């Protein structure tokens, strides 16, 4: 927009006595001082422009309740904004602030303040003057400390300080008894204040990517917690039965910490959670009976730990829908796996399995089975009953042949057999109606392909690189999968 077009918009706003002025997304460099005549405005939108300064005449808009300055190049604000005694929402995200503008601390009518993605380094004590703040966002700045005066914001409900450099929280934070959403992800927190337990309305606590080595015992008093994310810290234990007290917990993440065991407390601590993430720790066992009360537990991730076997009652996890045990030291899957009738995803990558239990074929709803990077020397005939299976990953195992029953996997679309010892594929491969991707690359003993492979009418991706295939015409295999399938098709019994 040119200066004249902006003035035309102001004049239209005046003539129509409009209470809303939207000048966003116009590449405006200068806001003309003529804005002073629009005293009836309650909402002024100027986001996504090129403003490097705001005219002091904006202070004449005494009726303003919303001022959005997002995505400009502002470094300051005129002191005349003192006169906006009714301002409720101020958005200064995506500017060039090295500080909270001095005048903002005097806008004590504010209930919503967005400072996200600037270069602010300090939160002055004067923050106490904004006692009506219910939503405060200082996400993605350079703040290294919060003043104790933050505890005077007793109406604070949502506080987002994600992506800063905080090492501690002032204990006075416990005076914000209304806080229900607290995001502290990606800071440098060494600990949490014991007063944190005062936040009895806290429902979401984001703490991923910090430096916590322990959780305060008083966190058990935040009984409204539904989402607790402790990913990537330095925690090895949880205080006595902390989880048992979180009666609304829906999902818990302990991944990327220092746990050698499950937190002590028994099955009472998992009675409500829907998903449990413990990947990338050093847990050496799943306790017997810890899920006996986990009636809604649907997703368990134990990837990259120290499991050498599964618990005796493994077969009782009838509500489990997604289970990840990759990168452990499992040498066998118990036959009791047949009890996981709700399991749809099973990840067993990078273990020490040489064979699979017969009970695997009872997982009637299993859709994804990842077995790459094991030592599998064969597949059980029971796999024929995995009728819901869509993806089967067997990359880098020791398979030489496939069970003929594999032809009953009519829902299978992805079959990854790369880096195996296959000598041939069963003729029943032709009944894989929905097969789309067949990876056979790096099978140095695979000298043939069955003509029935031409019957897979949805096959569009196949890799045979580094497969001998010496039983097929050399010029055929030299042409790649397109000529190979063509040969099997028009040279076979099914043309």
């Amino acid at each position: 927009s040119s200066n004249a077009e902006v003035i035309k918009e102001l004049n239209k706003c005046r003539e129509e006595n409009s209470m809303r002025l939207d000048l966003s997304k116009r590449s405006i460099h200068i806001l003309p001082s003529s804005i002073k005549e629009l005293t009836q405005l309650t909402e002024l939108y100027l986001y996504s422009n090129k403003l490097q300064s705001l005219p002091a005449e904006v202070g004449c808009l005494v009726n303003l309740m919303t001022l959005a300055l997002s995505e400009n190049s502002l470094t300051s604000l005129p002191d005349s904004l003192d006169n906006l005694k009714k301002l409720r929402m101020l958005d200064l995200r995506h500017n060039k602030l090295r500080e909270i503008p001095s005048v903002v601390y005097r806008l004590d009518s504010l209930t919503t303040l967005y400072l996200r993605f600037n270069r602010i380094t300090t939160v002055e004590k004067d923050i106490k003057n904004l006692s009506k703040l219910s939503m405060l966002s200082i996400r993605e700045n350079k703040i290294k400390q919060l003043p104790a005066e933050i505890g005077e914001l007793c109406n604070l409900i949502t506080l987002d300080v994600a992506h800063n450099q905080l090492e501690h929280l002032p204990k006075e934070i416990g005076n914000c008894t209304q806080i229900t959403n607290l995001d502290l992800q990606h800071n440098e927190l060494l600990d949490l204040p014991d007063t944190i337990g005062n936040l009895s309305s806290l429902s979401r606590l984001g703490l991923r990517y910090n430096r916590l080595s322990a959780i305060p015992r008083s966190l058990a008093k935040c009984s409204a917690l539904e989402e607790l994310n402790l990913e990537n810290n330095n925690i090895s234990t949880l205080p006595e039965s902390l989880l048992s007290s979180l009666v609304k917990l829906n999902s818990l993440t302990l991944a990327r910490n220092c746990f050698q065991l499950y937190p002590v407390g028994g099955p009472s601590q998992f009675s409500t959670i829907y998903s449990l993430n413990m990947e990338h720790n050093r847990i050496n066992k799943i306790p017997f009976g810890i899920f006996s009360r986990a009636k809604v537990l649907s997703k368990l991730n134990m990837k990259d730990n120290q499991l050498t076997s599964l618990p005796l009652d493994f077969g009782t996890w009838t509500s489990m829908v997604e289970l990840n045990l990759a990168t452990n030291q499992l040498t066998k899957i118990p036959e009791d796996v047949s009890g996981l009738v709700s399991l749809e995803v099973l990840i067993l990558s990078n273990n020490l399995l040489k064979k699979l239990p017969h009970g695997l074929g009872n997982l009637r709803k299993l859709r994804e089975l990842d077995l790459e990077e094991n030592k599998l020397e064969s597949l059980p005939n029971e796999i024929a009953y995995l009728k819901d299976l869509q993806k089967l990953v067997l990359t880098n195992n020791q398979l030489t042949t496939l069970p003929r029953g594999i032809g009953h996997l009519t829902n299978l679309t992805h079959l990854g057999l790369g880096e195996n010892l296959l000598t041939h594929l069963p003729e029943e491969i032709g009944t894989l109606e929905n097969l789309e991707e067949l990876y056979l690359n790096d099978n140095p003993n695979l000298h043939s392909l069955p003509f029935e492979l031409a019957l897979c009418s949805k096959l569009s991706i196949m890799s045979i690189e580094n497969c001998p295939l010496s039983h097929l015409p050399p010029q055929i295999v030299a042409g790649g999968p397109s000529f190979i399938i063509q040969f099997l098709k028009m040279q076979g019994p099914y043309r």
Binding site: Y114, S137, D160, D183, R204
Partner: peptide, 14 residues
């Protein structure tokens, strides 16, 4: 969650 500006916040606990 998506804030009024359309940006996401509280990712990790939403």
């Amino acid at each position: 969650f998506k804030d009024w500006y359309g940006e996401i916040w509280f990712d990790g606990v939403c």
